Design a protein that fits this description.
This is part of a larger assembly, with 10 protein chains of 10 kinds. Chain B has one domain: Glutamine Phosphoribosylpyrophosphate, subunit 1, domain 1 (4-Layer Sandwich), CATH 3.60.20. Chain B contains 6 helices and 10 strands; from the N terminus they run H-E-E-E-E-H-H-E-E-E-E-H-H-E-E-H. A 5-stranded antiparallel beta sheet of chain B has the order 8-1-2-9-10. In chain B, strands 3-4-5-6-7 form a 5-stranded antiparallel beta sheet. The longest helix of chain B is centred in the middle third of the chain and has 21 residues. Chain G has one domain: Aminohydrolase, N-terminal nucleophile (Ntn) domain (Glutamine Phosphoribosylpyrophosphate, subunit 1, domain 1, 4-Layer Sandwich), CATH 3.60.20.10. The radius of gyration of chain G is 16 Å and the shape is globular. By secondary structure, chain H is α+β, with helices and mostly antiparallel strands. Helices cover 35% and strands 25% of the residues of chain H. Chain H contains 2 helices and 4 strands. In chain H, helix 1 packs across helix 2. The two termini of chain H are 23 Å apart. The chains are: A alpha+beta (234), B alpha+beta (220), C alpha+beta (217), D alpha+beta (247), E alpha+beta (218), F mainly alpha (142), G alpha+beta (202), H alpha+beta (99), I alpha+beta (233), J alpha+beta (163). Chains A and C meet through helix 2 of A and loops of C. Chain J: GO terms for molecular function: endopeptidase activator activity.
Amino acid sequence: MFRNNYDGDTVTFSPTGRLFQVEYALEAIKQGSVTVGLRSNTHAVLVALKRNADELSSYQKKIIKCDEHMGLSLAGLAPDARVLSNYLRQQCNYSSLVFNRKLAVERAGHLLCDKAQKNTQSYGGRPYGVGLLIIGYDKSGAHLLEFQPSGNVTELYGTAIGARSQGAKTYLERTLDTFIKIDGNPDELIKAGVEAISQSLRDESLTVDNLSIAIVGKDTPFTIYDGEAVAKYI
Amino acid sequence: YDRALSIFSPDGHIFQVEYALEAVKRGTCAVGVKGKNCVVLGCLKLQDTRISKVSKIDSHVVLSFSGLNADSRILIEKARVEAQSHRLTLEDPVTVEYLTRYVAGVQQRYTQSGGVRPFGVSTLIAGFDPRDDEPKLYQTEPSGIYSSWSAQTIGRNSKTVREFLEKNYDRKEPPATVEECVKLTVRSLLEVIEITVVKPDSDIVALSSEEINQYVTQIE
Amino acid sequence: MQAIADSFSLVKELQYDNEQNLESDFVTGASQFQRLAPSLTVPPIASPQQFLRAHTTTLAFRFQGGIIVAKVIEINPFLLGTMAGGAADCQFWETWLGSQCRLHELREKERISVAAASKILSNLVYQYKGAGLSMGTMICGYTRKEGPTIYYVDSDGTRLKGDIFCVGSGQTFAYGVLDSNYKWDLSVEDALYLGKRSILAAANLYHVTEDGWIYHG
Amino acid sequence: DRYSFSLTTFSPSGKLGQIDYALTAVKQGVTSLGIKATNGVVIATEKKSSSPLAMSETLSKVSLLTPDIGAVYSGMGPDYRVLVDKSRKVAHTSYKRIYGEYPPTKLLVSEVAKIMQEATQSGGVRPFGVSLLIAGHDEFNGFSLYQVDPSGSYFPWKATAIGKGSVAAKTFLEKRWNDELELEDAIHIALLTLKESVEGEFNGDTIELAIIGDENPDLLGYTGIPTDKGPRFRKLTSQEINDRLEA
Amino acid sequence: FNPYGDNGGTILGIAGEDFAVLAGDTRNITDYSINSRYEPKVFDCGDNIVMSANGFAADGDALVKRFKNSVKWYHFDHNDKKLSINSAARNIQHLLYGKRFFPYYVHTIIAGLDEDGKGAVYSFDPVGSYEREQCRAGGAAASLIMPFLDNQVNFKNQYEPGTNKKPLKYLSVEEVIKLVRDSFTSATERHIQVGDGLEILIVTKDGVRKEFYELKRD
Amino acid sequence: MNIVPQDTFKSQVSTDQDKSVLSSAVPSLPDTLRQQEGGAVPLSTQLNDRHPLESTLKNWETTQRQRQMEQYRQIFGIAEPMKRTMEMEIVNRTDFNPLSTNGSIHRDILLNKECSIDWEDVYPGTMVGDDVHSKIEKQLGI
Amino acid sequence: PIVTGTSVISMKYDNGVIIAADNLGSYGSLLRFNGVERLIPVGDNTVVGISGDISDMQHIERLLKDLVTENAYLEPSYIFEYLATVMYQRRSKMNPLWNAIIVAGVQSNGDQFLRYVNLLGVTYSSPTLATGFGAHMANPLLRKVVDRESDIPKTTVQVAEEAIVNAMRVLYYRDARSSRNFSLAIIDKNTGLTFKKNLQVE
Amino acid sequence: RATSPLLESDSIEKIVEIDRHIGCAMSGLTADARSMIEHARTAAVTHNLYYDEDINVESLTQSVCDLALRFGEGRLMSRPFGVALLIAGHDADDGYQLF
Amino acid sequence: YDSRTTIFSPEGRLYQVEYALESISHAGTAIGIMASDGIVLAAERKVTSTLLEQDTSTEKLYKLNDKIAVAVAGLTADAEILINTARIHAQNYLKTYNEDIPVEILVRRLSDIKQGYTQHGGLRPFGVSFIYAGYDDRYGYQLYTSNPSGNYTGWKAISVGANTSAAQTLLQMDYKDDMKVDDAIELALKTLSKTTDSSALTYDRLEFATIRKVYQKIFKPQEIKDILVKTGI
Amino acid sequence: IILGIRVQDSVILASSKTRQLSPHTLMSFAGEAGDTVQFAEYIQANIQLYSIREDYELSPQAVSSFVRQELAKSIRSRRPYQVNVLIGGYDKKKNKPELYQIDYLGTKVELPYGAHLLDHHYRPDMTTEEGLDLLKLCVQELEKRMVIVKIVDKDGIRQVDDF
């Protein structure tokens, strides 16, 4: 009821301090499909259940690549995912051109945090309504960042985002003790990720078309496995 | 959902453009008829007659209108400026399709911001391409839609005059003589006179207020 | 506000604040390869022209069958351009012209008039008139309405039409030998013969038709 | 955000609401009045103060626009102050800097009216909540007195009054005005009108009065250019005003 | 202030059948002073493209860095599609002519394979005229490099002995490499700027190979 | 932190650099009729041998303003220049008036030019494109 | 260029790099300002030596302190790449920094780093680098100690240091703008950065 | 679709060429379709000019959708387009494909 | 729907412009009459009082040029903004072509100016309608009016302001196009005398002008009084 | 070369080009290539725009004033290009010919004849036949010292093959 009055913009607080308009953008992630990410100390893995609009249609590209060291996973609004991915990749590039240094994953995440915060406070725009998982490998080792479109970034061993991510995240919470030690045997980390994303499934099963995987590590630049390359892990 | 151009209706309508079409529906009626060799356009006591609603945009292309007169006059001025700008930048006179496309673009441009009113005018553009003799007739709408027509009517009585033309025109036996086009035009108007005849090679005549066609059609 | 604030919030020295610089160096995407009318760098000085300064025979005539022209840039399957002056400037601006023509034909759904194309060319060359762009493209084509059409275009922005154009080192010999024979009512192979004779007097053939230009070797 | 909607708009009656409300703000303001004589103009007003601790010598309600032109107002003092600043600036920029001479009163009034009108079109600002009485002399138009309203309309007046007392003052002026007044007669009539219009203490420190008259070379501040003209605007001192009140 | 200089050194593109060779000396010069004896003058740009912007060294570095970045963007946009040598040439043309009134004071050559796998060499004017070419020398000793090779890979102005033209031959990649070697040896023998070493990039359908050969240090 | 305007010459030139005045027929060349400059004859290449002062006098006030904002950033921090600029943009963006040439009365107060004259005040200095509609389209970006 | 710095000389050695500069700014022929330190250590692993306009020197030194202050939120190679980019963009702005700069240091992998850059953005590596008059007089002497990159592992720190001091002596003998006082820095992969101020030719 | 029999069906133009191997059929608010088609044509010709290579149909439709983004952050437009485009073409990369 | 001038109502009508039109129904009547040998302009000074300087209140009739004058009804501030814009336009035209501006070109420019303020949302319509009297050697004597909507029309005789319907009916009955200027003056005075809400058409309540012969005269109140008593009012 | 003669009935113009500004107004010009023709065609487009907007021919005096103003405005921004213009028109309102010359600085003067001898020949009362004879004489003396021909008339503009 009274929420209807105080929810018209990102610029009105309610009498309870809620800032509903940001909450609605955080709910916009729950409309996204599930994706899982996890890392060991030497390798980082992303797993995503793609979707297609109709049986006549191809599956949408849910994972991307900033550079040969870091990559990204999307859930939520496609236009905002496009914006943020272009932004993260234009920062990765400018960093390389001007300094010839791989942009630190943590720095890239902080840059996303900053970009996302602006839309939460000016009247005219809107919050990005999209969650991102960032993985990379640099001097500091393997990284996994979860980005929320409120402008919050956390470095995690594993997480899930999307409609039923709670299942996969509960599974990971039971098993983090196991996957973080998986060093130099990335195949077992990928299979652990596919297991984690085998929870939170509903009326569906993982298939070479609907499932996508990527990996990066000390010995392994960011590579995406999709289609027949995923059959090794299903 | 009515009070901005930016707002889609839940059923996908932009009501603020339909209200500009309703604004067109109130403007004084304009009629246009293509022949095979010509296009015909037609539509207080103390008025000073010496100081027509049919406006030449270039020697080969003509624009009539219906709706708000001042909006029409602004859009006519812009069309004239574009015609001369094309004739300067490129040696060829404007295509009639190029002119109507420009006019519809201008009308669309005044639809692309909630801070500006769209032109509440529909235009009837008639003429011939340079070095060509296919008669072309077009309508533009407040949305910046445009369409090619064999005959059309806009404004206050466009419904009945169009329903008349839909039966007295024949798509495969069109009027094949200037007098036949003028006859059909006057007949359509007499359902509710001024007539302009445009001919190839930049020949245009306001038809002298010849009542002969009126008397003949009243005899018929 | 925040945008204003961030204007007051290392990139100044290498000038990667400048948007057009970011584009030129392909920081802000490939946008430099996404613009018509390519942007040209000018030296940031009070006298750019001073800093810049401090850095064949061909023939055409109109006839019954079309035009024969005798380095002829294929602007389009219906337009030919005699590269003349600076080869870099010719290659670049004729490729740009061909793209403008393609856009015109797409939008208007007609083959561009040779008059229109030559006017576009002369206008652009004029706009850069006085800064490089040594240029002498003779523009040749056929259009259903226009028929056979010839326009010369110059670095100085001259534009001129005529039934015969003779250009290059033997231009006066070619012109003299042609005028001794030229006619409107030439037969096709007769016009080819007269053309070859007039080039030989000045020592490629291209035949220009409603269905496009043809190369006769 | 590229546009701001017009804050002043016509009502279905055809009346521009913000203009009516600015004229109401004028009606709410303290009385001021002016009177053309044959040989001058008077402008006068009450120095209403929020406290007796305020320095009345800083309540400059009457202000010089040119040596020959002065203004007074009723309503929002800050708006009057900004309008005075702008009118002085425009008197210099538009006219003195072009023609080498001060504008005639008619044209400075027209410039003030133009400035006030444009606040009625803008979608960023309200209109000014003041009306100004502008009195001045011109070499050709002679002495003149104009009333400028929040709309930016102006009319020439023989005498007028604005603010709370406006109607009763205008009736007293209409009965007492005549085409033969001398400047001392106009000053006396002005003082009697304000005595009838003022509320509470009526003294030379609760009033101020300025005149447009003959040149005052003792106010010119230099000597020896005999064609050069002393200011015709002159504010009366509260001493002189009290010496008038003892009449 | 003069915004240009001459850094000397030389480059040489040779197009084979299934290969292309791009060679350059590694000496860097200013005036009569040797700045360094080993700057890599020729660069692998990826996509089996090799490049060198000979001339003013700084503008060459700028142009090759802009090109490599443009290739990165080409890959991003077109999902790692191999940039074709003709598309690379058109890119470098637009990079060059964008400087039309403040040009990169460099002559640049790219070598690669076309979509047929045929050896390709392109050379570009500092204002971006370009041609497909079978061989091209560049830099100060280009006039020394080229005529010998035009006499040894081509047989121009040669005739069959007493039969007053001898036919041209296809050459193996190592044989043209050996001819580049000998040519640069002769040029360092006679031209003071031709560097202390010769670095050769060999483009093949298997990828690019780098070879380096020492030359006289004086 | 500049006294004399430094950055005062265009680094890049294109036929399309001038927007809002482009040919509709060929969106790569100027519209010389709408320019009303006396033809194409004011070709952009003729922007040469400019008066040495002009490139500094046009943008003197802009440079003074930028120095002032810089000084406020150095001494008062990012808040003060932000506030000043936001106020100024609010004034500029809300004052639309296609008929008046005169500067806004509040703009002068913000600039502290209430009691200042300059030659731009004294000397404030067409068949196509002068109309109110051209100003509307410029201001809204139609 | 009003106040100018004389010359920087440097060489790499088996475990590191040595760089030296004559600590003097000349006002034309007037040796106006002494004690103008022209070697700028930029963290533990690199020293940027700058020559030419001392005012432009102090502007590049503050650009470098700005670089370090931002990184605190470096390899020698990164500092060089930034410097070279600034230099070249200033050149293309037609507003050069009238300086020649050598970025000396050791990469975190232990590779010696030496690059020259000048107001033009011309860049090159070598076993030995010198700027200005040092490029003509000092470079011949250092190139006698390390002529080629195979000589690097043969060249001890003691010999490289004695060579640098000898080259500074020769510069003092034969460069009219040289001071007798100079500063020398040793950047060693094992012992780190040693920065010997106010050495004298003797 | 025809509002009336007097409308010339030969000028409705619901299918347009974008490039020699790429076409597009419109539906919806035709003015927005015109704007998208003009953008797509400009993109295609520019890609030809700069890369000597006809645009990949996927890259074309990517550019078209990048335009449709610009009702929000890349703002240009008061509202999203009221038009869907159905882009069909052929390229040497992926052959016949429909978007 | 009426809150701002840029919004069409569902009926397709611009209430804000109809309200700007209705604003003129409260301005004192102005009237203009074109004769065979000149044009008459007259207007009621509805804002009147004995303390107003009638002798210097030129307040409804303004000359924009030689051979052109305007009569104003509505907001005098907007009126004088438009009058000064039109004066500047006429002088720019004379400066460019060295010929006096045609009357219709000036009317068109002013009507386009008035129209534009109805089309941008940060502007209101001008609450003013002009009658234009002038002469040019193309159309000779010609007379126009224009509305807040920025449409205009040519008229032989026209009335604007409060009682325009009555005045226009009296014109339609009494006007004949072969009358002389001296006849049109009396027809104007009759019309205003029968139209005014005043008890009597006292000379101070009138402003009067004529364009004839080419010369234009704005009457001082003395000759206004004489023309009145000559007419018999 | 350009030449013009004002006659009792017509204006006669000659040149070794020209643009028709209106049915009763003709422009001829000489000067630098490109600059001169770009100017002449901008002028032509402006006069055509005016004629369309008003449905009325601009008089020859107003046309020559417009060309003067546009030439001065053209020079203000750039180096003066060498151009000279003859404008020959029949004033249908005054019912007489008028000829104007405009120099490269925008100096405009009404002339009985001009070019870019005849004082021994020219008479204001000449007919267009006498004018064409005087033109022939002038061209004969020009060829002794080392054309297209137009007439402007009540009936508009005329080509003359008797060059």
